[model samples]
Structure formats: structure tokens, C-alpha cells
Target: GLMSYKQFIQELEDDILPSEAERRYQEYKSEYITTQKRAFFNTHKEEDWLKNKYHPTNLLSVIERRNDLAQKVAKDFLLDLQSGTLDLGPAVTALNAAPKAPSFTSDPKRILTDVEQTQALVRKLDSEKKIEENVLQSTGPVVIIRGLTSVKGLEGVELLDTLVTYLWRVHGLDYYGKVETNEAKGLRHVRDENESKFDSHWQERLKGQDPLEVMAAKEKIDAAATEALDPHVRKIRDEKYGWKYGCGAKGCTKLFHAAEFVYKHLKLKHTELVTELTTKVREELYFQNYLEHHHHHH
Candidate 1:
């Protein structure tokens, strides 16, 4: 059953309010320290521990100083979340414009019914928009390789494997290119060239197979291509991608395998960018979870 907009808002408020309050309180405390430190350092620049040399006897002092700086940054970040200061950009903007308010009606039931309808429309639209964006970001070119007879069912299997490998490579490359500036541009150019080569190789491989075999093979290839890409597509979904605890289902295994495959290929093909993006994604995921936790509680 579809949840009403008011119910959705109520759920969000109920689930998120407490966490939001805690986050805001923590932010305030951290910001207060940062402010005090800034004032102190402005008047006594010479007392700045960060600018001074390390000493064995001053190890605890150094640790405390670093902790303070880290907390200050964390607090400012939480404050931004509370204020909705992050660049949600078009995604959030669309959500705000979604149908939510009830139409006026003299009858109480009619008013309630209108409100529910509006809420359902908003949720449906919001969910669809989010899903669409994820699909777009995750989608990429599908390359199908053809040819292999002695190994029965081998062509389909190998083609599927190759397509999956290609998708991961594409994802890793895109992520790498976003962070690495000049090198990223060069890598993208190389990735484009590689994609072309993959298509040509696929055609060459298909040339020797029989027509009927080729047709059957094509169907398998298509299925494989979709299957190969599913892991990445699913990862782009609203839920965070990670190893789930308990019986690791085939789906979970596939997700991790795809990520690992992507990681390995990126390490070999674009080491620096891969390393940087991996770290960035991990950090972003942590912060995203933090925000969600707070948002739900507040």
C-alpha cells in the first residue's frame, strides 16, 4: 500500500528527529571548541601546536590537539547537514516541487482523500525520479563477443563474463576520471578507444559461428550483458552497497564480486585514480549513512 505524504513526513520526523537532535547538539559543542581555539590562536599564534615540532613528552598534547581539530571539522559538517546546506542540487529541488498539499474540500473525508492522493503522487514521483537517475548513472555500453563452439555453452558464459568485466571497467574509469583532472581526461580517451576495440573484437569472433548458433548465442549474450550490469545497477540504488551479514546470497556475492573485479581492473589500469576514488567513495558512504541516520531520527 502506498503511504500518504503526511504519513511519510510523520515517519521521517518520528524516525529521524532524535538522531538529528543529537547530531546538532554534537555539532554545537564541536563548533564552540573551534571558535574558542580560533580566538585563542588569533591572539597567540605562537601557541599553535600544529605549527610546532613534535616531542616525545608532548605526545598526548599532540593527540589532543589533532582530536580537537578533527572534531571541529566533524561538527561543521553535521551543522551543514542540519541546515540542508549540502548541494542536493536538482534531485532535492524536484522533490520539493512534488504534489503534496491537499486540495480544498468542504467535506472532511474528501479533504482527507485529496491529501492522501497528493501524498501518494509525491512519493511515486519522487521514487521514480530517484530510480531513473540511478539507472542513468549506472548504465553504459554493452559489448557482446561472439564465437566459441567446442566448449558448449561457453560462448554465452564467456560473453557474460566479458560484459560484466567491461561494465566494472567502465564504472571504475568514470569514477577515476571525475577525480583525477588531466590524467582522468587521458584515461577517458583510452577507455573510449578500448570500447571500440571491444566491439570490433566481438564482431570478429561472431563471424565464424553458424547463423542459427549465432542467433541463439546472441540471445544468451544479451541476457549475460544485462546480468553483468545488474550488480553495478543495483549498487546505484538507494540502499548502500556493502557486504551483508549472514548467509551471503547469490545476489550479494555478485555485488561484491563486481566491486572486487572493478577494483582490481582499476588498480591495474588506473592505479592513482582508482585509489583516490575508492577512498572518496568510502568516505562519502560513511557521511551519507551518518546523514540518513540523523535525518531519520530528527
Candidate 2:
């Protein structure tokens, strides 16, 4: 039976033999790549964009290649608009006169019922790697203009620019951009943390562990030594603060005297966590906005 990711992580944490860990990791990697390839091909085989770019090695870069072509299409349209070869008055006017849609970014009360729509669109270009920043930034306008116009054929840069301007005026771009930036940061943080921890686990396997009984006895003796030398010592910070302002971030059990101390501790030790929380809030709201406009269930 193939090891599931859940099983792999547990085995990784407890496995004692370095060679066994290496073999298990390689097996997991092989299965992961194979499954991803099968899933990718099955999902995208029918799309015209996947025609010539379906080589096994380039499977990972399919989104990038597809989005690159889309970007070129958008950029050329912008170029024509800039050079005065294209007139956008009709397109822009039609969108302006169309029934206005409620903004998810501005309205917090309207929760997104179809969150998957937002997820699918956003993750299409972002599933494998970070899509280009321009592509990411233009994503909101692209969807906004598409939904507003409801035209299946050609797109215009005029309405895109108009929506971009509106978004910029209302700080929508900042909200959208912040969500992407934070999501990227969070993904990178988790990847790096996992890789480092996994490698450390491998290193520990190579070095071997001290006997559990020995380690427990050593821990007990250390605790007893500290207790023996500190008969009068107590948690002074808890006593002074009364409420005991503790650093609430995961993996931190630090206690402090004042709220200010807790704030500083977070700034120094858990800055990433703060950014992560902010990202979650912004992303939730941004998706809510996207769903509000694009949802099909009225």
C-alpha cells in the first residue's frame, strides 16, 4: 500500500533508520509526482491550450505557459489602445451603463456562497507556482470586466483600465494585492518550515536518538536541579501583571508582565504569524467580494 501524506509525516517523525526514511521518502515522492501527472493530464486534456504543451516534463509549467499567452493577448490589446489604433468608447460606455454589481470588497455582510468559483479562478494560474505579478494584479479586473460585459468573444482594454482605476480609487487593488502577497508568503513559509523540519528529522535519524528512559531521567534531573536551587523563586511576571499577558502565537509559551511586552515579543518572534492572520482576513474578504459578483445562485 502507498503511504498517504498523513502516514508519511508520522513515519517521518518516528522512523529511526536513516536508510529506511530515505527509501520511504523516495517512494512517497515517486507516488506524489505520478498522481499529480495523472490528475493534471486528466483534468486538462480537453483544453485547446494544453495541445502541444502536454509533455511530461513541462506539466508543472503548463499554467505558466497558458497564462503567458493570455498575458500577451492582453498586452497587445493594451498596446493598440495606447497607440490610438483601437477605440474603446463603445466598450467602455456599454460597461458603464450596465447594471452595477455589488462589490464584495466594500460590503462585508454579503458572505460568498460559492467560494469555489473564486478559488478555481485564483488557483488556476497559482496552483503550481506563483503566477507573474502583473497577471495576478490584472486577475481582478479580468474577472470583473468579464462578468460585467458577459461577452464570450473579444475583450477590450478600456473597460479593464476603467475597472483598474475604480479598484485603485477604492483601495481594491491594495486589498487584492495584499491577499496575494500574504498567500504567497504563507505558502513559502510553510514549504520552508516543512523542508527544514524534514531535513532535521533525517539528520536526527542519522545521528540516532538517546534512549527514551535516559532522556526522560535526564529531563527529570534537570527539573529537580532547578527546583532544588530555587526554593524562593516563583513566576514574578505572572504575579506582577496579575492577568499574565502571554505570547499567544503557536510554538511560543512565553509569558510577560505587560501587554506591551507581549506585543514586542510577537514583533520579534512571531512577525510571520501576524502577517499570516492579516492575510487570512484580507483573503476571506476578497473572495467574499469575488463570489458576490460572480456567483450563479443569485
User: Against the hidden reference, what TM-scores do the models get?
Assistant: 0.15, 0.19
In model 2, where do residues sit more than 4 Å from their true spots?
A: 1-59, 87-100, 103-298
CA-lDDT, candidates in order: 0.32, 0.37
Error of 2 at 51 (Å): 12
Please give the clash total of every predicted structure, in order. Answer: 8, 1
Per-residue alpha-carbon lDDT of candidate 2 for residues 52-76, written as tens digits (9 for 90 to 100): 2322223224434544644554454
Candidate 1 structure quality by residue, lDDT tens digits, 57-156:
2333443453354344334433333343423221211123322112222334433332322223223322322212111114322222122322122122
Task: Output the TM-score of candidate 2.
Answer: 0.19
